[PDB]
């Protein structure tokens, strides 16, 4: 590891600086270095890790979608099949995306998840595992597409089972997990009814628990609840 000689605390501090500078590839490399020190991560640290890689892979996904759209248009009957360049460059971006996903999944498997005993850490990491298999599923076309989809589903399902036993319905990790698992159902699993049912049940159960929250927790929970409603408005 290129970060192996840097102090854990220095890596975390530089991740925070990279975030302020909108240098998310650096942020992710710093947080990968911090994870590789082998100690469990605090709440703030888990969110630094997640924010870094979600921004990196988010940029790759956006680029891949542009390139895939160009590629599909270049293959419609009535175009001008220039040559291999669009496919080649889409594949390059795709391979880089798959490499980032594999890196994150490797950090979760070695060894974040197995050491995560508290619900807030374990559910957070299993949600991430579902998310990064979902990103792999978005680009998958070959013999392992069903298996990638089921790996996402299985991770999300374990996270949901823990969250329903261990967290209140307004817990923002529980809400964000359900938001993303609902998107998995709609966009990946071709299960729009399951996606709508999950988002609606999650929203209604959170609504009925809002009265227990402080003003600050209320703001956190209702933010994700609005995203659930936004998706339901898109889908219905």
């Amino acid at each position: 590891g290129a970060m192996g000689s840097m102090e854990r605390a220095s890596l975390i501090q530089k991740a925070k600086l990279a975030e302020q500078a909108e240098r998310y590839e650096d942020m992710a490399a710093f947080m990968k270095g911090a994870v590789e020190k082998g100690e469990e991560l605090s709440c703030e640290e888990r969110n630094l890790l997640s924010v870094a890689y979600k921004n990196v892979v988010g940029g790759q996904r956006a680029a891949w979608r542009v390139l895939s759209s160009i590629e599909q248009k270049s293959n419609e009957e009535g175009s001008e099949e220039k040559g291999p360049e669009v496919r080649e460059y889409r594949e390059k971006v795709e391979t880089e995306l798959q490499g980032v996903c594999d890196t994150v999944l490797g950090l979760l498997d070695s060894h974040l998840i197995k050491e995560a005993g508290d619900a807030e850490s374990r559910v957070f990491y299993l949600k991430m595992k579902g998310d990064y298999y979902r990103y792999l599923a978005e680009v998958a076309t070959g013999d392992d597409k069903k298996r990638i989809i089921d790996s996402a589903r299985s991770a999300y399902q374990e996270a949901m089972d823990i969250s329903k036993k261990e967290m209140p319905p307004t817990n923002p990790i529980r809400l964000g997990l359900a938001l993303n698992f609902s998107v998995f159902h709609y966009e990946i699993a071709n299960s729009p009814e399951e996606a709508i049912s999950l988002a609606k049940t999650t929203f209604d159960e959170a609504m009925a628990d809002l009265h227990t929250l402080s003003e600050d927790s209320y703001k956190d929970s209702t933010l994700i609840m609005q995203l659930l409603r936004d998706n339901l408005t898109l889908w219905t």
């Binding site: 998310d131 938001l179 709609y186 966009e187 994700i224 936004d230 998706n231 898109l234 889908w235």
Partner: peptide, 5 residues
């Protein structure tokens, strides 16, 4: 595209 976090 749908919202995720």
């Amino acid at each position: 595209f749908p919202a995720t976090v």
